[PDB]
Design a protein around this ligand. Structure first.
Ligand code: NA
Lengths: 206, 198
């Protein structure tokens, strides 16, 4: 009967938490899209979100911080890591789904919910899952209590990961992850379970 | 994108926030509750969770606090409400789904799923309508309820059936809705990160 909470990773020894974080606001500070548009820094707004996120996470025990190689993810992760004495570790498997088609067009957003991206959903989920597993594997276990790892990534890849863990097809999990939102996973080896999704309540304060 | 944000009410102006909260731990002290097991107070562990939740929400503008008539919901709501000088308001429509059969995935309850969703959605709408708008900013109402009825509401708002939203809401978790009269959108689900705070 409690094989149902073995699959829920509840009351199970050696469960780690992964706090999936969408990066903060970018496209560069809005004097104009002044810098290199291919890898923009956080905007002035995004820098403020990243501060509120880093303050909220300052109060939590944290044992590793990972990000994609995108500047906007790195800069969000760096604010978080600095509150804890951690390095940011980088993994290309956390990059956003490929959105541009090779023939010249961008990815549409059909209402139906047929998956619209040129990189297949199962590929995105597999690299995201592998990254999450590898990050936990790379983190020494917390001295007391739950090993916790922050992972800073990108909206569509994060939702694709969470939907795959929840057995929900593209667009069934009909929500948009806020910038600097926190979604918590529970991880025990290759078992991985969604605990919470999309919380950006630290943006309510300021 | 313009149409997107209108679907999700993100960037739409007159949207209110409803922070749906599962009540804190109860059935209270020991194997043997010394109290009335039909309507238990929070446990020692539940009072601690409620303190953490109250400290988390102390820094958020809040304009109203509602709960079911269950003691464990009321006591959780009271701890939140006390940080803002608010009165706890009570609505029976926020009660847990009926769990017991009159005689004694597949939806397991005698109270059908759609009725639970309807009374929960109506309660949320009525609470927002009962809250004077914020002086400046988003009007925000905390609503303390029960795990199954909360998940049924969120699933119904996302056109998911029972079991598709395959999550259990932690005790004292916060799930945020965006509300505009009859439009109502799930923005976050199940966050109990204040219980990690050392
Ligand atoms: Na940088």
């Amino acid at each position: 009967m409690r094989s149902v909470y073995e699959r829920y990773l509840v009351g199970v020894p050696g469960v780690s938490e992964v706090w999936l974080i969408r990066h903060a606001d970018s496209y560069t500070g809005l004097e104009d899209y002044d810098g290199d548009p291919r890898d923009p820094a956080l905007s002035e707004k995004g820098r403020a979100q990243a501060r509120l996120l880093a303050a909220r996470l300052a109060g939590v025990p944290l044992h590793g911080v990972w990000a994609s190689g995108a500047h906007r993810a790195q800069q969000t992760a760096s604010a978080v890591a600095a509150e804890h004495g951690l390095r940011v570790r980088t993994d290309a498997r956390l990059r956003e789904v490929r959105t541009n088609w090779d023939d010249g067009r961008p990815s549409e957003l059909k209402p139906h919910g047929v998956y619209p991206f040129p990189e297949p959903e199962k590929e995105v989920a597999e690299r995201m899952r592998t990254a999450v597993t590898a990050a936990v594997a790379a983190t020494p276990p917390a001295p007391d209590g739950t090993t916790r790892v922050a992972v800073v990534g990108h909206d569509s890849a994060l939702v694709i990961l969470m939907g795959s863990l929840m057995n929900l097809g593209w667009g069934q999990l009909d929500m948009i992850l806020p910038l600097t939102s926190v979604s918590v996973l529970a991880v025990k080896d290759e078992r991985m379970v969604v605990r919470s999704i999309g919380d950006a309540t630290h943006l309510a304060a300021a």
